């Protein structure tokens, strides 16, 4: 369970609480939240005070639970306001408490997993992490676990690493004190004079030189940073994603005017004039790169791998790069519908589109209707243009409002923040974690009714009122999906088609396809009937569900009548002896004929049970009339 | 092209929109929380073109569908990591694109999108005024669960447990009984025959409608069926973006289960509240909130029913002139009235067919034909006639 602005914890202090560790002051709490190993993490003051309040509440609850155990306003061991507590050594209470422990363990695991995903998604709760206390093994493990796994392209990894190094070197002055340790790796990064060798030959190269790609690529990325004012990882990702596409003149055109190419080349040349001295003491797109297997195997690129990890786990700032690169928004994410229509303004005429969809077999769109269609299409375009501006601003405002807090089930959703985060989660693992949390909550709620009991006199008065099968039991025909499947499949024609009417599924591929389609239609009709029965009492929902039933039944009956006609007409008998011997006993044709007419499911009077209604046809139609 | 892009996005372990607050993309609750394309159509008028859930039963159906497909998505993700390893080993853009399109064709991702099949000009307009099939192909962010249900066995459980079904049956019976007694109270007041009398007195001012000289031609023209008779519906003004989003959000907000709703609300508040809790304390708070919500809902339903039907004594229990002192008002509901009508219906009734000793009462078709039907031959004959459309005998 996680919202857009959740604070899922990442530390496990329940072990310390059960062993007796108590943080007394702020220094003690910080010593608790310190990680004595690799992958150090820096937090925010709000997150820290939230964690401190949580720790104090945990301590108060633990001591209250200890007080309740000693007893063995309202302590956790107290009963509900209208319940009584069973003896401690009883089977019901022991099972309930075991379920309580299981549910709480599941909830803690879900919270820890959510916190881990939040930490590795680079949310504002954890501003940064550092890998200073990490070895080469730890660096390679991080690389494999995050970058290689989440990257489809190997060359994009090299591009990202070089861009991270370039942007870090360019923005070196504006960094806190804790960010100084990465500059050692930045300097230790080794490049190869690949272009030097052909000039000398006019091509032998060292393997260690081949492992590192080149230095002209780094100069190209520095040129890119100078051109596009790259200052954070989100914009680095955007400009690295949409620079190989042959539209960087317009697609990557930044909202601020980019610097002149001559100025950028002068800056690059000055940097090279300093770099040559240091070593002694518009560029084209970069070419091929050595494999990432070499990257993570060799230690020549080890500082490059370290700075790549640093850039991947840092430089993530909560801001949208689309305010700086408005054109790149359409390439990075799906464009707005209004913008899609504006781009396909040359869609000819809506009347022409309708004509090409309908085809030549039909009358060609009377002129007055075509004119009305064109006028309506133009009006729709005008409405889209008018509302495009209002929709963008209003949509952002509604997400961050009091309504989202009041009803977080619908308005609040993770991965719905205004800023862009290239390392956003797939929202499938988070959904699974939410499912585990809610099932644990259901188990805990089930166990809380087993832990406690009602009064003996209350249960005695309850038992004085016996339950009779006549009128005090749930009907055996309660609406369930298998209940509605069984009634449909027990129909003589449906059963005939399923068993022997259709060709055998295993032997015939087309028979298997027909069986799949028949099952799909049967399931659709049964699901529609089940929904109609569930929402039978609600008038409008009953009407719309009955429309769904009509559609599904019509589809199923069309398929069934087609199959019945085909199996009746498939009299593929080479000789008359085969026909006579088929007619001698009950074959498929004669069994199909004996059944009689197939009653259409559309013309039926089922209601809330799958059984024909006892009311008159007029009343049934009035009930199942389409909504007005 | 679009299929290859969708398959690449599905391969990627990141959000296709990167968590960005994008227009016309809805983080559907029933579809887990993955974004889905929900453009705000203006041909229908400020209407979001996305399914609007009606019932928490549909919500649970969707949730259990995701539970059922959880097995498929794991193996699919293993296959996706194998394909991603193959792409990483690949170094040619053409080879990558060919592999992507082959995998998309194998996974049937292009079948995730659904195109409006229509031939009628109005139906075509309602979909092609804005986002046409081209826009459907373009903004077609696929889902791993959608791909899983593209090829997977169909579940039958629907995910509703015994307690949920018991509650649903109880509330269905309660709503049906309350509606029936409200209608019987209305009939007892007699406003139904007042409606009939109002219809009778309204018939005075009516006049014979004009069915046309050629009645078939006139009826067809009214239906808009003949060539050139099609009239487009009026262009309704689109709603505000806030209202258009709010209706869709409330559709799922009123269909969420109580446990999930309270859990989400308490987890959202836990960051802001001055006394945050972790673990067992939060679990206890959730349980207490759920119990309080249940008992308050029961109390509110009972109180609204009592207010509507005027239940309970009208003031002091022990009056000088007897404990039963009811003041009846014209055209108002009362517990005494309800009890009296029930008494008139079934004072000393042992069976529904108690007064069926005479054929005239016995053969009445007011309540239904259940008592008239007595053999399976007659039942089958009646159902066959009803299915064939002819009048029931």
């Amino acid at each position: 369970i996680t919202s857009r602005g959740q604070f899922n914890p990442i530390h496990n202090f329940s072990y310390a609480m059960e062993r007796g560790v108590r943080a007394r002051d702020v220094k003690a709490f910080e010593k608790l939240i310190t990680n004595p190993g690799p992958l150090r993490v820096a937090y925010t003051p709000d997150y820290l005070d939230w964690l401190h309040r949580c720790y104090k509440a945990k301590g108060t609850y633990m001591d209250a639970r200890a007080v309740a155990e000693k007893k063995f306003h309202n302590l956790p061991g107290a009963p509900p306001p209208g319940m009584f507590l069973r003896p401690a050594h009883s089977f019901r209470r022991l099972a309930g408490e075991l379920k309580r422990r299981r549910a709480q363990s599941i909830l803690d695991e879900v919270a820890r997993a959510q916190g881990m995903l939040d930490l590795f998604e680079r949310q504002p709760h954890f501003p940064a992490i550092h890998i200073d206390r990490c070895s080469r093994f730890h660096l390679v493990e991080l690389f494999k676990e995050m970058v290689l796994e989440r990257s489809l392209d190997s060359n994009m990894i090299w591009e990202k690493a070089l861009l991270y190094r370039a942007i870090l070197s360019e923005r070196k002055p504006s960094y806190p004190t804790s960010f100084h340790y990465i500059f050692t790796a930045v300097e230790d990064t080794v490049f190869a004079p690949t272009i030097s060798t052909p000039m000398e030959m006019a091509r032998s190269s060292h393997p260690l030189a081949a492992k590192c790609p080149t230095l002209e690529a780094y100069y190209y990325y520095v040129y890119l940073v100078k051109k596009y004012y790259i200052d954070n990882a989100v914009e680095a990702h955007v400009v690295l994603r949409c620079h190989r596409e042959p539209n960087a003149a317009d697609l990557l055109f930044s909202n601020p005017p980019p610097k002149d190419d001559t100025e950028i080349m002068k800056a690059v040349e000055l940097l090279r004039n300093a770099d040559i001295q240091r070593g002694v003491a518009p560029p084209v797109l970069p070419g091929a790169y050595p494999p990432i297997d070499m990257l993570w195997r060799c230690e020549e690129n080890l500082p490059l791998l370290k700075v790549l990890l640093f850039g991947e786990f840092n430089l993530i700032v909560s801001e949208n790069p689309f305010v700086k690169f408005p054109s790149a928004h359409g390439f990075l994410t799906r464009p707005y519908s209004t913008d899609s229509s504006r781009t396909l303004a040359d869609g000819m005429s809506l009347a022409n589109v309708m004509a090409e969809k309908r085809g030549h077999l039909l009358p060609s769109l009377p002129r007055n209707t075509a004119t009305s269609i064109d006028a309506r299409a133009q009006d729709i375009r005008r409405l889209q243009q008018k509302h495009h501006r209002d929709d963008i601003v209003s949509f952002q405002k509604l997400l961050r409002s009091t309504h989202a807090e009041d009803s977080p089930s619908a308005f609040s959703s993770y991965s719905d923040w205004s800023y862009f985060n290239p390392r956003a989660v797939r929202a499938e693992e988070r959904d699974r974690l939410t499912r585990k949390a809610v099932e644990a909550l259901k188990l805990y709620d089930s166990a809380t009714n087993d832990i406690y009991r009602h009064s003996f006199e209350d249960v005695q008065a309850c038992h004085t009122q016996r339950v009779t099968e006549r009128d005090r039991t749930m009907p055996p025909y309660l609406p369930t999906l298998p209940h509605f499947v069984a009634i449909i499949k027990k129909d003589p024609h449906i059963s005939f088609l399923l068993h022997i009417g259709l060709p055998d599924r295993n032997s015939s591929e087309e028979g298997s396809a027909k069986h799949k389609e028949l099952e799909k239609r049967i399931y659709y009709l049964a699901r529609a009937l089940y929904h109609t029965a569930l929402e039978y009492h609600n008038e409008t929902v009953r009407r719309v569900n009955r429309q769904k039933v009509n559609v599904a039944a019509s589809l199923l009956d069309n398929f069934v009548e087609q199959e019945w006609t085909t199996i009746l007409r498939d009299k593929h008998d080479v000789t008359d002896v085969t026909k006579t011997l088929n007619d001698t006993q009950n074959d498929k044709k004669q069994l199909a004929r004996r059944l009689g007419r197939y009653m259409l499911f559309a013309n039926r009077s089922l209601d809330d049970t799958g059984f024909p209604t006892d009311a008159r046809a007029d009343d049934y139609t009035r009930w199942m009339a389409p909504p007005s | 092209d679009w299929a290859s892009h969708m398959q690449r996005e599905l391969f990627g372990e990141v959000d296709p929109l990167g968590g960005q607050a994008h227009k016309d993309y809805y983080r559907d609750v029933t579809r887990g929380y993955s974004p889905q394309y929900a453009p705000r159509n203006f041909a229908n008028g400020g209407a979001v073109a996305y399914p609007h859930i009606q019932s928490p039963y549909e919500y649970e159906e969707a949730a259990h569908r995701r539970v059922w497909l959880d097995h498929d998505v794991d193996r699919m993700r293993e296959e996706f990591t194998q394909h991603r390893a193959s792409l990483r080993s690949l170094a040619s853009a053409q080879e990558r694109e060919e592999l992507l399109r082959s995998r998309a064709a194998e996974y049937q991702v292009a079948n995730t999108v659904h195109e409006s099949e229509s031939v009628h000009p109005i139906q075509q307009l309602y979909n092609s005024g804005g986002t046409s099939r081209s826009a459907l192909k373009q903004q077609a962010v696929a889902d791993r669960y959608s791909i899983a249900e593209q090829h997977s066995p169909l579940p039958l459980t629907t995910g509703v447990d015994r307690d949920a079904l018991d509650e649903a049956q109880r509330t269905k019976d309660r709503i049906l009984n309350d509606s029936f007694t409200a209608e019987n109270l209305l009939i007892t007041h007699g406003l139904r025959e007042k409606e009939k009398h109002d219809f009778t007195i309204l018939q005075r001012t009516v006049r014979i409608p004009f069915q046309g000289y050629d009645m078939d031609r006139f009826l067809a023209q009214q239906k808009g069926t003949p060539y050139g008779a099609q009239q487009l519906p009026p262009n309704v003004v689109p709603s505000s973006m806030e209202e258009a989003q709010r209706t869709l959000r409330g559709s799922s907000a009123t269909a969420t289960p109580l446990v999930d709703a309270v859990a989400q609300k308490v987890y959202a508040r836990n960051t802001v509240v001055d006394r945050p809790a972790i673990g067992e304390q939060l679990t206890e708070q959730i349980i207490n909130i759920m119990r309080a919500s249940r008992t308050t809902a029961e109390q509110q339903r009972e109180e609204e029913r009592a207010q509507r039907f005027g239940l309970g004594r009208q003031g002091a229990l022990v009056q000088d002139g007897g404990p039963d002192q009811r003041t009846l008002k014209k055209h108002t509901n009362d517990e005494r009235i309800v009890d009296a009508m029930l008494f008139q219906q079934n004072a000393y009734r042992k069976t529904p067919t108690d007064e069926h000793w005479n054929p005239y009462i016995r053969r009445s078709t007011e309540n239904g034909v259940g008592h008239l039907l007595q053999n399976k031959f007659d039942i089958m004959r009646r159902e066959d006639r009803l299915s064939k459309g002819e009048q029931d005998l």
């Binding site: 009343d619 139609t621 009035r622 009339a625 | 409200a182 239904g368």
Partner: peptide, 30 residues
């Protein structure tokens, strides 16, 4: 506001539409 799921006498109806008039003027015989 005619109620739903209501059994009406064959000689009359709710009156919602033409197919369900207030008073049925058509016989149910042959």
């Amino acid at each position: 506001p005619a109620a739903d799921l209501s059994r009406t006498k064959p000689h009359e109806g709710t009156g919602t539409s033409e197919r369900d008039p207030y008073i049925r003027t058509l016989h149910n015989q042959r």
